[PDB]
Design a protein around this ligand. Sequence first.
Ligand SMILES: COc1ccc2c(c1)cc(C(=O)NS(=O)(=O)c1ccc(C(F)(F)F)cc1[N+](=O)[O-])n2CC(=O)O
Ligand SMILES: COc1ccc2c(c1)cc(C(=O)NS(=O)(=O)c1ccc(C(F)(F)F)cc1[N+](=O)[O-])n2CC(=O)O
Ligand SMILES: COc1ccc2c(c1)cc(C(=O)NS(=O)(=O)c1ccc(C(F)(F)F)cc1[N+](=O)[O-])n2CC(=O)O
Ligand SMILES: COc1ccc2c(c1)cc(C(=O)NS(=O)(=O)c1ccc(C(F)(F)F)cc1[N+](=O)[O-])n2CC(=O)O
Lengths: 272, 283
Amino acid sequence: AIPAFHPGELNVYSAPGDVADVSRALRLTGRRVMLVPTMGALHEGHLALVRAAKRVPGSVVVVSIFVNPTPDDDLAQLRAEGVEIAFTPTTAAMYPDGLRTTVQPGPLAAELEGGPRPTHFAGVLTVVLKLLQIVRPDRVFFGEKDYQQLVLIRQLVADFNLDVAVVGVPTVREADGLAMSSRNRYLDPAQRAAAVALSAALTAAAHAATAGAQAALDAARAVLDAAPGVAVDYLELRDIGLGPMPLNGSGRLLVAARLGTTRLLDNIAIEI
Amino acid sequence: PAFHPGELNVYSAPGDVADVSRALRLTGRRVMLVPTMGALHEGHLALVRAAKRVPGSVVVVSIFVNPMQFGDLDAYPRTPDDDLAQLRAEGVEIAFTPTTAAMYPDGLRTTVQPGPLAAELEGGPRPTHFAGVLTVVLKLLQIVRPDRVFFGEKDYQQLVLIRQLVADFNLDVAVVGVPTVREADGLAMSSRNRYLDPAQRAAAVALSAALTAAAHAATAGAQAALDAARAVLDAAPGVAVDYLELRDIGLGPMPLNGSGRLLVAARLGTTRLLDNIAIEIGT
Ligand SMILES: COc1ccc2c(c1)cc(C(=O)NS(=O)(=O)c1ccc(C(F)(F)F)cc1[N+](=O)[O-])n2CC(=O)O
Ligand SMILES: COc1ccc2c(c1)cc(C(=O)NS(=O)(=O)c1ccc(C(F)(F)F)cc1[N+](=O)[O-])n2CC(=O)O
Ligand SMILES: COc1ccc2c(c1)cc(C(=O)NS(=O)(=O)c1ccc(C(F)(F)F)cc1[N+](=O)[O-])n2CC(=O)O
Ligand SMILES: COc1ccc2c(c1)cc(C(=O)NS(=O)(=O)c1ccc(C(F)(F)F)cc1[N+](=O)[O-])n2CC(=O)O
């Protein structure tokens, strides 16, 4: 028997087998299954992931809420957007044999964010793989804010021959350009004001780039240097797959910085 | 890609087999995967026959000597003509024969990291071996998307780790272990048996004799079982034992209770032979 599912309502499932069965049944009825993986505390960046998923014709949207080891609020937000499935497993349900077979990323995981957090991406890719196998979506949606993460997921998909489409959704930003993040609330007024330097550096670089890569890097560095209390961890221009930047062509510029105790990240498309 | 039913269709491109598989599954057929490294013998054909018995099945047999799980690699026997001939004789409809470049276009990048079992027994001296195995098996399962996948029980550790992969990454496939096919004297079928000279082939009977001796001795307890098997191994000329271990059936971090598996590995000249058996303690 398929678990109960009411079209056009929010249906909540905490058991991996239940969401798996419902998803399978829905695919067999027409629908194109979309997955938006989250850690809850839904914000406007997640709204953008959900909206992108909703507009695929014949979509049913699954939003997972899972913290790797309000809910009331999150669920009402999903209802308001017309999401039909929430998948809300316990740690036990995801890891019933505990930590055992895992995903080992390629060497990109050791670079950039992998310096301060050398095992973080192993966890991310392990959980993303599991969610993909459980839900079996046609398309999975991620923000571009965590660009290295996104690139690693694309590697996962290519490397293990997964049959899902990975969709990256442009970063949602505050009115001054600060990339949305659960961390922004912690900034005091001076830090919040300084934090605009990250996005201003990157947008300056993207426009400076007609004058070449060095001009782009030097423009972003100059903007970051205008900001007090912004400790830059890295500022790197790479190809779009995060290898070495080619002489000209498309790239990505990534920054990370610490403001007081808070780490912020941002990145942007660059054309040289 | 063309699929002619009742004939052997050989596909190298992963995309071709993936498409044929998906199309079959959508027309009601259930897809069975028999993943092998070639050099096929009657034990592999037992896998195929098992798979064939599943009502409405279509059987895919993969043949791929996976470089990521190894002069070792160059030494592995390759007999593709015999292999395809045997499959056609068994009525298999799909053989999947990918190139190394098709499987590993980006070389080694994302991989499967097994749990701690991979560092024991066969894995202790070979620390990446089972990573290589689980990585290729994951890939073959994603490509083919079978309903069921079939392995022999002879490489029991490998089988258990595959069960762990399946569980741990929520794969939607049933894993089927098929009991080891044996020569008339008891010797486990293996693509490595061809490397036994006549004397070593005679002596090799000691593995299976030891294991069956232990399974019967076990009414007298674990010590009697192990000591029976050791005695048979010790009486055999030219058999050098690498390990003989009685473990719980999952080979996991739990002591032996009523049901165990007794594992042996031993070298005959340069040939390393494995075997195992179910053991019931006190029966
Ligand atoms: C489209 O615009 C944006 C802008 C920022 C975004 C997002 C979208 C999404 C996130 C985000 O979810 N961050 S998250 O750390 O909660 C997270 C972490 C891991 C995973 C993954 F699936 F990959 F494991 C997903 C999410 N997630 O919540 O989409 N964040 C950053 C944040 O949540 O702080
Ligand atoms: C059927 O004919 C052949 C020919 C060569 C073979 C094999 C079979 C199997 C291997 C091989 O390496 N198997 S193995 O990678 O599973 C292996 C071999 C020896 C050890 C040992 F524990 F002894 F070190 C471990 C493994 N292993 O399971 O990691 N090799 C390569 C080799 O022995 O170097
Ligand atoms: C206990 O002694 C050892 C000795 C070497 C080990 C390890 C343990 C573990 C690794 C290891 O995982 N290396 S690796 O990440 O490059 C790796 C991972 C997976 C695979 C495989 F293909 F098999 F899936 C191969 C490698 N590798 O080493 O080529 N390596 C090889 C290394 O670090 O280069
Ligand atoms: C039902 O009866 C049997 C009896 C023995 C079997 C099989 C079936 C299947 C195999 C076998 O080797 N299958 S396999 O080609 O996928 C394979 C090849 C090499 C390795 C190695 F250890 F070298 F890595 C393992 C497997 N495997 O079976 O886990 N073998 C073992 C062998 O040929 O040594």
